[PDB]
């Protein structure tokens, strides 16, 4: 019956992870407005003919 | 076109048709560009390839 309130009153709990990943983040969208051009050096120079 | 049919007035009248024509003469066109050969030779990038 009688017991310190720092052992039983502390350990009478059940940890659950329902709250984990409850919310999300905005989906990727840069694909719809940009192309992917891989690079192999410090910079990329572009040139086109008129 | 043939003349319109009309009521005979007492003596039939000879009419005539109207034919015409239209002529068009050919025209000659040109478009050209000049480039130094060294630029093409020094074209490792390939800028002048789509010419």
């Amino acid at each position: 019956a009688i017991i310190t309130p720092a052992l039983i009153s502390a350990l009478k709990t059940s940890f659950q992870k329902h709250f984990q990943d409850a919310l999300a983040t905005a989906p990727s969208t840069y694909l719809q407005v940009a192309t992917v051009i891989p690079s192999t050096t410090a910079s990329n120079t572009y040139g086109w003919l008129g | 076109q043939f003349p319109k049919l009309r009521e005979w007035i007492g003596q039939r009248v000879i009419k005539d048709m109207a034919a015409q024509g239209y002529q068009i003469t050919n025209k000659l066109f040109e478009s050209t560009v000049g480039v130094k050969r060294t630029d093409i030779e020094d074209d490792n990038l390939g800028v002048y390839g789509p010419l």
Side-chain angles (χ1 to χ4, degrees):
Chain A
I2 309 311
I3 188 147
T4 55
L7 183 140
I8 297 294
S9 304
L11 290 174
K12 300 289 94 176
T13 185
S14 189
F15 179 80
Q16 295 297 289
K17 65 179 73 175
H18 290 84
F19 279 53
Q20 180 67 237
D21 272 302
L23 58 94
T25 315
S28 184
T29 302
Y30 82 98
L31 283 71
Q32 306 179 40
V33 295
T35 45
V36 180
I37 305 180
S39 178
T40 68
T41 191
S43 71
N44 279 351
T45 302
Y46 300 90
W48 56 106
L49 190 62
Chain B
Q1 275 178 19
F2 204 71
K4 257 188 196 175
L5 275 71
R6 65 185 182 80
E7 183 178 1
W8 165 78
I9 56 166
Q11 186 187 356
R12 302 173 77 176
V13 180
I14 301 299
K15 300 188 186 286
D16 63 358
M17 291 184 185
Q20 57 252 37
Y22 182 56
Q23 187 182 256
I24 313 156
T25 303
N26 297 303
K27 283 212 189 154
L28 179 53
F29 301 87
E30 65 84 30
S31 60
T32 187
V33 302
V35 59
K36 189 180 286 294
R37 77 182 281 169
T38 50
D39 305 354
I40 294 284
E41 296 174 305
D42 309 331
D43 192 24
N44 303 352
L45 264 57
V47 178
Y48 315 135
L51 188 153

